[PDB]
Design a protein around this ligand. Structure first.
Ligand SMILES: Cc1cc(CNC(=O)c2cc(C(=O)NCc3ccc(F)c(C)c3)ncn2)ccc1F
Ligand SMILES: [Ca+2]
Ligand SMILES: [Ca+2]
Ligand SMILES: [Zn+2]
Ligand SMILES: [Zn+2]
Length: 169
């Protein structure tokens, strides 16, 4: 027999993702690079592996949409909500949605897609919001301006509480 896991998490280390569509704001290459880097933020500190699918059903379906887009969390035009992701689970579980009424960039202007994506994938993997103002999972977008991204310890401890550290070096 098997009882449901204690925490909401993926029961397999091999996860797949698919970029269903693209925002008008960035080139396909820029978007792909941003998401790849965002997944690496988490795979680097756990035993998780992320493989990209170009079609079909992936564990983490990624899409850009506006207003009503297929769930109970419609976006709201420019400003306000910017994105959200569902926790681990069947069907839409793990999926990540980005409000395409926002401005997405690979710089410090508007919302940095990589940064927001890293945050959303944290949710896709089982992390909720943190009270640490400097955490990636803090609820409010707070671009620091630093030239190098480093996953804050709070996030490292959180993600490893779910999946273990994988290779520690
Ligand atoms: C090269 C480089 C360097 C950096 C430097 N790092 C940061 O600025 C940074 C920001 C955050 C942060 O604001 N967290 C909260 C949050 C984040 C996203 C999101 F959608 C919501 C709703 C809330 N946390 C940790 N570090 C960034 C991008 C980049 F490309
Ligand atoms: Ca919005
Ligand atoms: Ca899914
Ligand atoms: Zn949605
Ligand atoms: Zn969030």
């Amino acid at each position: 027999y098997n009882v449901f896991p204690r925490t909401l998490k993926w029961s397999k280390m091999n996860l797949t993702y698919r970029i269903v569509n693209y925002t008008p704001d960035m080139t396909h290459s820029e978007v792909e690079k941003a998401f790849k880097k965002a997944f690496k933020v988490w795979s680097d500190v756990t035993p998780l592996n992320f493989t990209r699918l170009h079609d079909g059903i992936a564990d983490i379906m990624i899409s850009f949409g506006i207003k009503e887009h297929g769930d109970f969390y419609p976006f709201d035009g420019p400003s306000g909500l910017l994105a959200h992701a569902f926790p681990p689970g069947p069907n839409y579980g793990g999926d990540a949605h980005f409000d395409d009424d926002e401005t997405w960039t690979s710089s410090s202007k508007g919302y940095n897609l990589f940064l927001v994506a890293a945050h959303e994938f944290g949710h896709s993997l089982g992390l909720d919001h943190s009270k640490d103002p400097g955490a990636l999972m803090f609820p409010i977008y707070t671009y620091t301006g630093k030239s190098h991204f480093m996953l804050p310890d709070d996030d490292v401890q959180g993600i490893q509480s779910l999946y273990g550290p994988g290779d520690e070096d």
